[PDB]
């Protein structure tokens, strides 16, 4: 919505004001768990198994990611946010004049090995990094040799000096002397001389001196980071300005696993392992770990812990987010082969409309051929993965689980008890030519079913999503706009169009269009509407009645 | 009901899902008795 | 400018269902796929081994449905034979122990004053002589002065001919600095030397070698007035000698010397790999459908099964046929079928004998029969069955009875039944069943039915990608998409590759980037029971 | 754990060394897991072709798909 050109003019012309608009939720799933890689107190977006495996090298979190993507093979692999719990630190070592620190966080980082060398022909330093766990190897050759200087005059004395600012030790001058006087001095006070290229060109401009930019990779360093060479016979032999401290940023900093700094001079040293890499331990308080997911757009979050303390802290967190205007839900699973009493004690310790409890624990056949027996919370990650894979407002009732086997194949009594007490449970369906596992209900830990918005996950999700979209769109659209005479009618038509588009997608059942009334008075705009919520079938009765009938011919 | 690329891709591509089961009770009978081979319960 | 133009089209003259094989071979490079069309091409490539016998069998499995474009590979990690003499390095093209008996040997000829090479390999009746090594040109003098000499020397930094000088007495007539200028080759040098009033540099009568100027050897202070002195350049000339004809390559690490007619060494066939995963990967994107490993090992079978499943997951469907052992009991076959239990894998039970074109009554294990069955399947049309087709097997190690065949088929095992006095052969294939024993599912159980589905989906995918993706979206696009699909489905019907399709069910919807399509098909089948009832009547 | 779970990776790595030759046994498909190998204590490789035995693993493998009888090690 801008004019062409974007420069108003008064002389006669013909302008165009094209409007490019008009030709245009994701339900992100979150995860918190254990892995041998990635920074602490950080959230990372995942879309591919390889991408996860790059950062999260190994651990239960990678298995949980694989289960969550594999929980819905008929549906796409959606966005997933992952976090590490351990307060890990990187491996680092100080050898020579340089500070060496690895990017990887944990004890795996200690295997990284770095060592500096030198090449006799080029009179240049060399760097090599090895990481034997993945057969990784890199070489940054020709450290130094930023540009040469050559002197073609017939006088006996011709040298150059680089002078530093004494207070900060920054290179301040590049002086080129002949005899016992300064023919030229590049006083690094300002201008284009801050970059060495300009210096190289102006040295080429000199009648005697000449400077050639390095053919061993164009470096183009700032003049303040150059090295210091004095009493070098430029006339007899070409003298190599090096500026290795610049080569650090040029080569080593922008690439590779290992970062480099200086505390001292850069000198060669043998390939030495880094140390100091620590995985750490999880903290007592998990509230800081959850708070990073404040503004990330995620709706479903599941921790890889059966502890009731983490469950209570998550229940507190997701409620606080919901009060703050960012509604969420959590799903959790208790231990290995826990009895019904423990599921009742857990549920009675939660009673929260934004939390669901998972009872069944079993085995999942991973893509690597592993029959990975797992606790209930991995099953809760599978259910979250399934729920994220469905559309908005859908229900996980009677969906297939795609597990291999379950520890406790329940009967009708246990499934009824669990359903009534508000615990999600899973049945192996025996009645058939071929057999599978299905989730019997989507009930939340809140026991009383009087309000299905609170009791049912699907209704509560449709409610959350509808309110959030409507509120954000109404902010984005009409706040700050003129209160013209047609505003009310425009607002009504917009809300009708939004509800119709919801109905079209089948996120809502139906609404009465006439009831969408808009009242405008002063700065306030009052709106009243009615919408019938979408519901999912959970009881079917058939009243069959037999009869007899006579036939003739 | 498998898409022909099992994992969906973001690039411009053609994606094909086929009802494999569209190309295609029994009233099973049972017997219990004495025999001279096979397991005692199975 | 104005001009005439002419175009020709050929797309209307015409999948191919390419067939693959991996196995042991006595020749060819390792870890390298080849495309084969003729038997002489495979004999040149693969000198011998089981793989060549499998290629022959595949192109001679059936009289009417032999396969084509067979893709072959050598699993042996072989190396070529090599040897060293003086400054020379000798290395043979052939990989394996066969190159060891290649004979190589340098000599000298006194009449020409020139080295000689002779290479003999009696296995292929190879015997050739490369006389007149070096001897590039003759320098001759026609003046009557006191003396006349020349001199060529190398540049030690690069071993290049620094100069080329002609002298009368002590001073120089004209010197050609070969390290510079445009005199890169000896012919540029001789064409200008012959123009001198009293000097000639006649190129040698032993062919026009035309060697690089920089590679001339080091000769100084030789009488031109008395002798037609030879500048040689033996190593550079050996490239001209071995330009086109020669089994053995040569290199120089130094000076070359004659030596005895010595045989090569170091030629190694190598042990076979334990796991074929690295070998199998090379067929990732070769376009093959049927692959059969030439091995009786269950581990290889599992590896191939994993490979074909991965390629089918990547949009490249493949199927495998496996076998092994000699006279394997039914228990082993059931164990192998239970271990695999894969739709895309088929097990072969019978092993027997085949009459090669060479006359060998080759008694072979069961995977060679699985090669033959694969070659016959690939020969058939898309969705045609290998049921009751002739196999032309000479004999079999067993003759299974009507109960044994019914057991093998109920266990998802392919078998061959003896049959008497039929027009083609005395054997036929009973069924095209897979290892997956769910007979209720026709796609997984029957090889033909799933091959039809897979080729249909692949062809539809490839044509839709090629045609419309990347093009423009206009009003006629939807109609054009529907017309193209209808034409494709009518082509498939015309070729009997499907039973029928309702044209009205084809729908197309276009919205921005997407193009949503839907259609219905009645899929192809081949009969497996034929019933005939008769009714008798009379008149009084 | 890892690539060496089976004897195949051990055979390939040994044969990768130019100084060694460790052809697998030709009598059918053994391919035993590397956990079940029997103990060896400095067996000379230069003068002899040392065979790794692993008796009970091969007993289990051969008698798996064949015969009614089953076996267990005490």
Coordinates of C-alpha atoms in Angstrom, one line a residue, chain C residues 14-539:
Chain C
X14 CA 7.9 -45.2 -27.6
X15 CA 8.8 -47.4 -18.1
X16 CA 11.4 -49.9 -19.1
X17 CA 11.7 -51.9 -15.8
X18 CA 15.4 -52.2 -15.6
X19 CA 17.0 -55.3 -13.9
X20 CA 20.0 -55.3 -11.6
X21 CA 22.6 -57.9 -10.4
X22 CA 25.4 -57.8 -7.9
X23 CA 27.8 -60.7 -7.5
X24 CA 31.3 -62.1 -7.9
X25 CA 33.2 -61.4 -11.1
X26 CA 36.7 -62.0 -12.5
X27 CA 37.1 -58.6 -14.2
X28 CA 36.0 -55.0 -14.2
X29 CA 36.5 -52.2 -11.7
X30 CA 35.2 -52.3 -8.1
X31 CA 32.4 -50.2 -6.8
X32 CA 31.4 -49.2 -10.3
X33 CA 28.0 -49.7 -12.0
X34 CA 27.8 -50.4 -15.7
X35 CA 25.0 -50.6 -18.3
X36 CA 25.0 -53.7 -20.4
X37 CA 23.1 -54.4 -23.7
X38 CA 25.2 -57.0 -25.5
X39 CA 27.0 -60.2 -24.3
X40 CA 30.2 -59.2 -26.0
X41 CA 30.2 -56.0 -23.9
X42 CA 29.8 -58.0 -20.7
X43 CA 32.5 -60.4 -21.8
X44 CA 34.9 -57.6 -22.4
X45 CA 34.0 -56.0 -19.1
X46 CA 33.5 -59.0 -16.9
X47 CA 36.2 -61.5 -18.0
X48 CA 34.6 -64.5 -16.2
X49 CA 32.9 -65.5 -13.0
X50 CA 29.4 -66.3 -11.8
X51 CA 28.1 -62.7 -12.7
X52 CA 28.7 -63.3 -16.4
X53 CA 26.9 -66.6 -16.2
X54 CA 24.0 -64.8 -14.5
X55 CA 23.9 -62.1 -17.2
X56 CA 23.8 -64.9 -19.8
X57 CA 21.0 -66.8 -18.0
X58 CA 19.0 -63.5 -17.7
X59 CA 19.2 -62.8 -21.4
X60 CA 18.4 -66.5 -22.0
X61 CA 16.0 -67.3 -19.2
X62 CA 12.9 -67.3 -21.4
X63 CA 12.5 -67.5 -25.2
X64 CA 10.0 -64.6 -25.4
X65 CA 10.7 -62.3 -22.4
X66 CA 14.4 -61.8 -22.0
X67 CA 15.3 -58.6 -20.1
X68 CA 17.4 -55.6 -21.1
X69 CA 19.8 -52.9 -19.8
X70 CA 21.0 -55.2 -17.1
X71 CA 23.0 -53.3 -14.4
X72 CA 26.0 -55.2 -13.1
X73 CA 28.6 -54.8 -10.3
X74 CA 31.7 -56.5 -9.1
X75 CA 31.9 -57.1 -5.3
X76 CA 35.6 -58.1 -5.2
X77 CA 37.9 -55.4 -3.8
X78 CA 40.5 -56.3 -6.4
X79 CA 43.7 -54.3 -7.4
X80 CA 45.7 -54.1 -10.6
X81 CA 49.0 -55.7 -11.2
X82 CA 52.0 -53.4 -11.2
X83 CA 55.8 -53.4 -11.4
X84 CA 58.8 -51.0 -11.3
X85 CA 62.0 -50.9 -13.3
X86 CA 64.6 -48.2 -13.3
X87 CA 62.7 -44.9 -13.2
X88 CA 59.5 -46.4 -14.8
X89 CA 56.2 -47.3 -13.1
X90 CA 54.2 -50.1 -14.8
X91 CA 50.5 -50.5 -14.0
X92 CA 47.9 -52.7 -15.8
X93 CA 44.3 -51.8 -16.5
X94 CA 42.9 -55.2 -15.5
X95 CA 41.9 -55.6 -11.8
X96 CA 42.8 -59.0 -10.2
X97 CA 45.3 -61.8 -10.6
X98 CA 44.8 -62.0 -14.4
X99 CA 47.1 -58.9 -14.9
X100 CA 50.0 -60.7 -13.3
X101 CA 50.6 -62.8 -16.4
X102 CA 50.9 -59.7 -18.6
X103 CA 54.4 -59.7 -19.9
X104 CA 56.3 -56.4 -20.3
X105 CA 59.9 -55.9 -21.5
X106 CA 62.1 -53.2 -23.1
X107 CA 64.8 -53.9 -25.6
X108 CA 67.1 -52.0 -27.9
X109 CA 67.5 -52.1 -31.7
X110 CA 71.0 -51.6 -33.0
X111 CA 70.0 -50.9 -36.6
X112 CA 67.8 -47.9 -35.6
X113 CA 69.7 -47.2 -32.4
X114 CA 66.3 -47.1 -30.7
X115 CA 64.7 -48.8 -27.7
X116 CA 61.9 -51.3 -28.3
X117 CA 58.9 -52.4 -26.3
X118 CA 57.1 -55.8 -26.5
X119 CA 54.0 -56.7 -24.5
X120 CA 52.6 -60.2 -24.7
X121 CA 49.4 -61.6 -23.0
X122 CA 48.8 -65.1 -24.2
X123 CA 45.4 -65.5 -22.5
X124 CA 43.8 -63.1 -25.1
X125 CA 46.3 -64.0 -27.9
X126 CA 47.9 -60.5 -27.6
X127 CA 51.3 -60.0 -29.0
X128 CA 52.6 -56.6 -30.2
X129 CA 55.9 -54.8 -30.7
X130 CA 56.5 -51.0 -30.4
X131 CA 59.7 -50.5 -32.3
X132 CA 61.5 -47.2 -32.7
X133 CA 61.0 -45.8 -29.2
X134 CA 62.0 -42.2 -29.1
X135 CA 64.0 -41.4 -32.3
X136 CA 61.9 -38.3 -33.1
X137 CA 64.0 -36.6 -35.7
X138 CA 67.4 -36.7 -37.5
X139 CA 69.7 -33.7 -37.6
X140 CA 71.8 -33.5 -40.8
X141 CA 74.4 -31.1 -42.1
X142 CA 75.1 -30.1 -45.7
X143 CA 77.9 -27.6 -45.3
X144 CA 81.7 -27.8 -45.8
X145 CA 82.9 -25.9 -42.7
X146 CA 85.3 -27.2 -40.0
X147 CA 82.6 -28.8 -37.7
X148 CA 78.8 -28.7 -37.0
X149 CA 77.2 -29.8 -33.7
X150 CA 74.0 -29.3 -31.7
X151 CA 73.0 -29.4 -28.1
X152 CA 69.8 -29.9 -26.0
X153 CA 69.8 -29.7 -22.2
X154 CA 67.1 -30.0 -19.5
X155 CA 66.0 -27.3 -17.0
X156 CA 66.5 -29.1 -13.7
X157 CA 63.8 -27.1 -11.9
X158 CA 61.2 -28.6 -14.3
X159 CA 63.1 -31.2 -16.4
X160 CA 62.1 -29.3 -19.6
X161 CA 64.4 -28.8 -22.6
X162 CA 66.0 -25.4 -21.9
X163 CA 67.5 -24.8 -25.3
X164 CA 67.9 -26.3 -28.8
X165 CA 71.0 -25.0 -30.6
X166 CA 72.6 -25.5 -34.0
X167 CA 76.3 -24.6 -34.3
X168 CA 78.9 -24.3 -37.1
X169 CA 82.2 -24.8 -35.5
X170 CA 81.9 -23.1 -32.1
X171 CA 79.3 -20.3 -32.6
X172 CA 75.6 -20.7 -33.0
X173 CA 73.5 -20.4 -36.2
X174 CA 70.1 -20.2 -34.5
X175 CA 68.9 -21.3 -31.0
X176 CA 65.3 -22.3 -30.2
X177 CA 64.6 -21.7 -26.5
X178 CA 61.9 -24.4 -26.1
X179 CA 60.9 -23.3 -22.6
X180 CA 59.4 -20.2 -24.2
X181 CA 57.8 -19.0 -27.4
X182 CA 55.3 -20.8 -29.7
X183 CA 57.6 -23.8 -30.4
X184 CA 55.6 -26.1 -28.0
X185 CA 55.9 -29.1 -30.3
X186 CA 58.8 -30.6 -32.3
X187 CA 57.0 -29.9 -35.6
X188 CA 57.1 -26.2 -35.0
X189 CA 60.8 -26.6 -34.4
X190 CA 61.6 -28.7 -37.5
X191 CA 59.6 -26.6 -39.8
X192 CA 61.9 -23.6 -39.0
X193 CA 65.1 -25.6 -38.7
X194 CA 64.8 -26.9 -42.3
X195 CA 64.6 -23.3 -43.6
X196 CA 68.2 -22.7 -42.6
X197 CA 70.6 -22.6 -45.6
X198 CA 72.8 -25.6 -44.6
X199 CA 71.0 -27.5 -41.9
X200 CA 68.1 -30.0 -41.7
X201 CA 66.2 -31.5 -38.8
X202 CA 64.2 -34.2 -40.7
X203 CA 61.5 -35.8 -38.7
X204 CA 62.3 -39.5 -38.3
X205 CA 61.0 -41.9 -41.0
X206 CA 59.4 -44.0 -38.2
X207 CA 56.1 -42.2 -38.3
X208 CA 55.2 -38.6 -37.4
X209 CA 55.6 -38.8 -33.7
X210 CA 55.2 -35.0 -33.0
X211 CA 56.2 -34.8 -29.4
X212 CA 56.3 -31.9 -27.0
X213 CA 59.3 -29.6 -27.4
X214 CA 60.0 -29.5 -23.7
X215 CA 60.3 -33.3 -23.3
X216 CA 63.4 -33.7 -25.5
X217 CA 66.3 -35.6 -24.0
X218 CA 69.8 -34.4 -23.1
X219 CA 72.2 -34.8 -26.0
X220 CA 75.2 -32.5 -26.5
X221 CA 78.3 -32.4 -28.8
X222 CA 77.5 -34.8 -31.5
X223 CA 78.8 -34.6 -35.1
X224 CA 76.1 -33.6 -37.6
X225 CA 78.6 -33.5 -40.5
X226 CA 79.5 -37.1 -40.1
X227 CA 76.2 -38.6 -38.7
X228 CA 72.5 -38.1 -38.9
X229 CA 72.3 -37.8 -35.1
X230 CA 69.1 -38.8 -33.4
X231 CA 67.4 -36.8 -30.7
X232 CA 65.3 -39.4 -28.9
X233 CA 63.0 -38.3 -26.0
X234 CA 62.2 -41.9 -25.1
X235 CA 59.7 -41.2 -22.3
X236 CA 57.6 -38.6 -24.1
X237 CA 57.6 -40.8 -27.2
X238 CA 56.3 -43.8 -25.3
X239 CA 53.0 -41.9 -25.1
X240 CA 52.9 -42.0 -28.9
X241 CA 53.9 -45.6 -28.9
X242 CA 51.1 -46.6 -26.3
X243 CA 48.7 -43.9 -27.6
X244 CA 45.8 -46.3 -28.5
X245 CA 46.9 -49.9 -28.4
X246 CA 48.1 -51.3 -25.1
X247 CA 46.9 -53.1 -22.1
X248 CA 49.5 -51.7 -19.7
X249 CA 50.1 -48.0 -18.9
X250 CA 53.5 -46.5 -18.1
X251 CA 54.8 -43.6 -16.0
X252 CA 58.2 -42.2 -14.9
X253 CA 58.9 -41.4 -11.3
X254 CA 65.5 -40.6 -13.5
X255 CA 66.3 -42.6 -16.6
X256 CA 64.7 -45.5 -18.4
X257 CA 66.6 -48.7 -19.2
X258 CA 65.9 -51.9 -21.1
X259 CA 65.0 -55.0 -19.1
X260 CA 63.9 -58.6 -19.4
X261 CA 60.4 -59.7 -20.5
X262 CA 59.1 -59.6 -16.9
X263 CA 55.7 -60.5 -15.7
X264 CA 53.7 -58.1 -13.5
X265 CA 53.0 -58.5 -9.8
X266 CA 50.7 -57.3 -7.1
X267 CA 47.5 -58.3 -8.9
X268 CA 45.0 -59.3 -6.2
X269 CA 41.4 -60.4 -6.5
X270 CA 40.8 -59.7 -2.9
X271 CA 38.4 -61.4 -0.4
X272 CA 34.7 -60.7 -0.8
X273 CA 33.0 -58.1 1.5
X274 CA 31.1 -59.5 4.5
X275 CA 28.4 -56.8 4.2
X276 CA 27.1 -55.4 0.9
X277 CA 25.7 -52.1 2.3
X278 CA 28.4 -49.9 0.8
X279 CA 28.1 -51.9 -2.5
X280 CA 24.3 -51.7 -2.5
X281 CA 24.2 -47.9 -2.0
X282 CA 25.6 -47.3 -5.5
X283 CA 22.2 -48.5 -6.9
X284 CA 20.4 -45.7 -5.0
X285 CA 19.5 -43.6 -8.1
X286 CA 20.2 -46.0 -11.0
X287 CA 16.5 -46.4 -11.8
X288 CA 16.4 -50.2 -11.3
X289 CA 13.3 -52.1 -10.1
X290 CA 14.2 -55.8 -9.8
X291 CA 17.5 -56.6 -8.0
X292 CA 18.8 -60.1 -7.1
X293 CA 22.0 -60.6 -5.1
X294 CA 24.2 -63.5 -6.2
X295 CA 24.6 -64.9 -2.7
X296 CA 22.9 -67.5 -0.5
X297 CA 23.5 -65.5 2.7
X298 CA 20.6 -64.5 4.9
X299 CA 22.5 -61.4 6.0
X300 CA 22.8 -60.1 2.4
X301 CA 19.1 -60.9 1.9
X302 CA 18.2 -58.7 4.9
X303 CA 20.5 -56.0 3.6
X304 CA 18.8 -56.0 0.2
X305 CA 15.4 -56.0 1.9
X306 CA 16.4 -52.9 3.9
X307 CA 17.8 -51.3 0.8
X308 CA 14.7 -51.8 -1.3
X309 CA 12.5 -50.6 1.5
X310 CA 14.6 -47.4 1.8
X311 CA 14.4 -46.8 -1.9
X312 CA 10.7 -47.3 -1.9
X313 CA 10.4 -44.8 1.0
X314 CA 12.4 -42.3 -1.2
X315 CA 9.9 -42.6 -4.1
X316 CA 11.9 -45.3 -6.0
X317 CA 10.0 -48.6 -5.5
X318 CA 12.1 -51.8 -5.8
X319 CA 11.6 -55.5 -5.4
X320 CA 14.0 -58.4 -4.7
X321 CA 14.1 -62.1 -5.3
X322 CA 16.4 -64.3 -3.1
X323 CA 17.5 -67.9 -2.8
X324 CA 20.3 -70.1 -1.7
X325 CA 21.7 -73.5 -0.9
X326 CA 21.4 -76.8 -2.9
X327 CA 18.4 -78.9 -2.1
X328 CA 17.2 -76.9 0.9
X329 CA 14.6 -78.7 3.0
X330 CA 11.2 -77.1 3.5
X331 CA 12.0 -76.2 7.1
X332 CA 14.9 -73.9 6.0
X333 CA 12.6 -72.3 3.5
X334 CA 9.9 -71.6 6.1
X335 CA 12.5 -70.3 8.5
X336 CA 13.8 -67.9 5.7
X337 CA 10.3 -66.8 4.9
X338 CA 9.5 -66.1 8.6
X339 CA 12.8 -64.2 9.0
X340 CA 12.1 -62.0 6.0
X341 CA 8.3 -61.6 6.0
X342 CA 8.5 -58.7 3.5
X343 CA 6.0 -57.9 0.7
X344 CA 8.9 -56.6 -1.5
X345 CA 10.9 -59.9 -1.2
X346 CA 10.3 -63.2 -2.9
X347 CA 11.9 -66.6 -2.0
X348 CA 12.8 -69.3 -4.5
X349 CA 12.9 -72.9 -3.3
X350 CA 14.0 -75.0 -6.3
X351 CA 17.6 -75.3 -7.6
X352 CA 18.6 -77.1 -10.8
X353 CA 20.6 -77.0 -14.0
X354 CA 20.9 -74.8 -17.1
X355 CA 22.4 -75.4 -20.5
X356 CA 24.6 -72.4 -21.3
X357 CA 25.2 -71.3 -24.8
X358 CA 28.9 -72.3 -24.3
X359 CA 27.7 -75.9 -23.8
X360 CA 28.2 -76.1 -20.0
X361 CA 25.6 -78.1 -18.1
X362 CA 25.9 -75.7 -15.2
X363 CA 24.4 -77.0 -11.9
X364 CA 23.7 -73.9 -9.9
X365 CA 22.2 -73.0 -6.5
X366 CA 18.7 -71.4 -6.1
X367 CA 19.6 -67.7 -6.4
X368 CA 20.6 -68.3 -10.0
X369 CA 17.1 -69.5 -10.6
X370 CA 15.9 -66.3 -8.7
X371 CA 18.0 -64.3 -11.2
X372 CA 16.2 -66.1 -14.1
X373 CA 12.8 -65.5 -12.5
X374 CA 13.7 -61.8 -12.1
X375 CA 14.8 -61.5 -15.7
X376 CA 11.6 -63.1 -16.8
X377 CA 9.5 -60.8 -14.6
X378 CA 11.3 -57.7 -15.9
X379 CA 10.8 -59.0 -19.4
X380 CA 7.0 -59.0 -18.9
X381 CA 4.7 -56.1 -19.4
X382 CA 3.8 -53.8 -16.4
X383 CA 1.3 -55.8 -14.3
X384 CA 1.6 -59.1 -16.2
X385 CA 2.1 -62.1 -14.0
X386 CA 4.9 -64.7 -14.0
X387 CA 2.2 -67.4 -13.3
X388 CA 2.4 -70.5 -15.5
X389 CA 5.2 -69.0 -17.7
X390 CA 7.9 -71.4 -19.1
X391 CA 11.3 -71.3 -17.6
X392 CA 13.4 -73.6 -19.8
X393 CA 15.3 -75.1 -16.9
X394 CA 17.0 -78.3 -17.9
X395 CA 16.4 -80.2 -14.7
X396 CA 15.8 -79.7 -11.0
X397 CA 17.2 -81.2 -7.8
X398 CA 13.6 -82.1 -6.6
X399 CA 10.2 -82.8 -8.0
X400 CA 7.6 -81.6 -5.4
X401 CA 4.2 -83.2 -5.3
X402 CA 0.8 -81.5 -5.4
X403 CA 0.7 -81.4 -1.6
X404 CA 4.3 -80.0 -1.3
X405 CA 3.5 -77.3 -3.8
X406 CA 0.3 -76.4 -1.9
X407 CA 2.3 -76.2 1.3
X408 CA 5.0 -74.0 -0.3
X409 CA 2.4 -71.7 -1.8
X410 CA 0.5 -71.4 1.4
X411 CA 3.7 -70.4 3.1
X412 CA 4.4 -67.7 0.4
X413 CA 7.2 -69.6 -1.3
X414 CA 7.7 -69.7 -5.1
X415 CA 8.1 -73.2 -6.6
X416 CA 8.5 -74.9 -10.0
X417 CA 6.5 -78.1 -10.8
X418 CA 7.6 -80.7 -13.4
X419 CA 5.2 -80.9 -16.3
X420 CA 5.3 -83.3 -19.3
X421 CA 5.0 -82.8 -23.1
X422 CA 4.1 -79.1 -23.2
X423 CA 4.9 -77.3 -26.3
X424 CA 7.6 -74.9 -24.9
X425 CA 9.3 -76.4 -21.9
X426 CA 8.9 -79.3 -19.3
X427 CA 8.6 -76.8 -16.4
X428 CA 6.4 -73.9 -15.4
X429 CA 6.0 -71.3 -12.6
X430 CA 3.1 -72.2 -10.3
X431 CA 2.5 -68.8 -8.7
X432 CA 3.9 -65.2 -8.3
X433 CA 3.4 -65.1 -4.5
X434 CA 5.5 -63.0 -2.1
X435 CA 6.9 -63.8 1.4
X436 CA 4.1 -61.8 3.0
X437 CA 1.6 -64.5 3.6
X438 CA -1.5 -62.3 4.0
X439 CA -3.4 -63.7 1.0
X440 CA -6.4 -61.6 1.8
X441 CA -4.3 -58.5 0.8
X442 CA -3.8 -58.7 -3.0
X443 CA -1.3 -55.9 -3.2
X444 CA 1.2 -57.3 -0.7
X445 CA 0.7 -61.0 -1.6
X446 CA 0.8 -61.0 -5.4
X447 CA 4.0 -59.6 -7.1
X448 CA 2.1 -58.6 -10.3
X449 CA -0.7 -56.5 -8.5
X450 CA 1.8 -54.5 -6.5
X451 CA 4.1 -53.9 -9.4
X452 CA 1.2 -52.5 -11.4
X453 CA 0.3 -50.1 -8.5
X454 CA 4.0 -49.0 -8.1
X455 CA 4.5 -48.4 -11.8
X456 CA 1.2 -46.5 -12.0
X457 CA 2.1 -44.2 -9.1
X458 CA 5.7 -43.6 -10.2
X459 CA 4.6 -42.8 -13.8
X460 CA 1.9 -40.4 -12.5
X461 CA 4.3 -38.7 -10.2
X462 CA 7.0 -38.2 -12.8
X463 CA 4.6 -37.0 -15.5
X464 CA 2.9 -34.5 -13.1
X465 CA 6.2 -33.2 -12.0
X466 CA 7.7 -32.8 -15.5
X467 CA 4.5 -31.3 -17.0
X468 CA 2.8 -28.7 -14.8
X469 CA 5.2 -27.9 -11.9
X470 CA 7.1 -24.7 -12.6
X471 CA 4.6 -23.6 -15.3
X472 CA 2.0 -20.8 -15.3
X473 CA -1.5 -20.9 -13.7
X474 CA -4.1 -19.7 -16.1
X475 CA -7.9 -20.3 -16.7
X476 CA -7.2 -23.2 -19.2
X477 CA -4.8 -24.9 -16.7
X478 CA -7.5 -26.9 -14.9
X479 CA -9.2 -28.2 -18.1
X480 CA -5.7 -28.9 -19.5
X481 CA -4.8 -30.9 -16.4
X482 CA -8.0 -32.9 -16.6
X483 CA -7.5 -33.6 -20.3
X484 CA -3.9 -34.7 -19.7
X485 CA -5.0 -37.1 -16.9
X486 CA -7.9 -38.5 -19.0
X487 CA -5.5 -39.0 -21.9
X488 CA -3.0 -40.8 -19.6
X489 CA -5.8 -43.0 -18.2
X490 CA -7.1 -43.8 -21.6
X491 CA -3.5 -44.7 -22.7
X492 CA -3.2 -47.0 -19.7
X493 CA -6.5 -48.6 -20.6
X494 CA -5.5 -49.1 -24.2
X495 CA -2.3 -50.8 -23.1
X496 CA -4.4 -53.2 -20.8
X497 CA -2.4 -51.8 -17.8
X498 CA -5.7 -51.2 -15.9
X499 CA -9.2 -52.6 -16.3
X500 CA -11.2 -49.4 -16.6
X501 CA -11.7 -45.8 -15.2
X502 CA -14.8 -43.6 -15.0
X503 CA -14.0 -40.3 -16.8
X504 CA -16.5 -38.1 -14.9
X505 CA -15.0 -38.9 -11.5
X506 CA -11.8 -37.0 -12.4
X507 CA -11.9 -33.7 -10.7
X508 CA -9.4 -30.8 -10.6
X509 CA -9.3 -27.8 -8.3
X510 CA -6.8 -24.9 -8.6
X511 CA -6.1 -22.4 -5.9
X512 CA -2.9 -20.4 -5.8
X513 CA 0.1 -22.8 -5.7
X514 CA -1.9 -26.0 -5.0
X515 CA -3.7 -28.2 -7.5
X516 CA -6.0 -30.6 -5.8
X517 CA -7.0 -33.7 -7.9
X518 CA -9.0 -36.9 -7.4
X519 CA -9.9 -39.9 -9.5
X520 CA -11.1 -43.5 -9.4
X521 CA -9.6 -46.6 -11.2
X522 CA -10.5 -50.3 -11.5
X523 CA -7.1 -52.1 -11.2
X524 CA -5.6 -54.8 -13.4
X525 CA -5.6 -58.5 -12.5
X526 CA -4.6 -61.8 -14.1
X527 CA -6.8 -64.9 -13.8
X528 CA -6.1 -67.5 -11.1
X529 CA -9.2 -69.7 -11.4
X530 CA -11.1 -70.6 -14.6
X531 CA -14.3 -72.5 -14.2
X532 CA -16.4 -74.2 -16.9
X533 CA -19.7 -76.0 -16.5
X534 CA -21.5 -78.1 -19.2
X535 CA -25.1 -79.0 -19.7
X536 CA -26.3 -82.0 -21.7
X537 CA -29.6 -82.2 -23.6
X538 CA -31.2 -84.5 -26.2
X539 CA -34.1 -84.6 -28.6

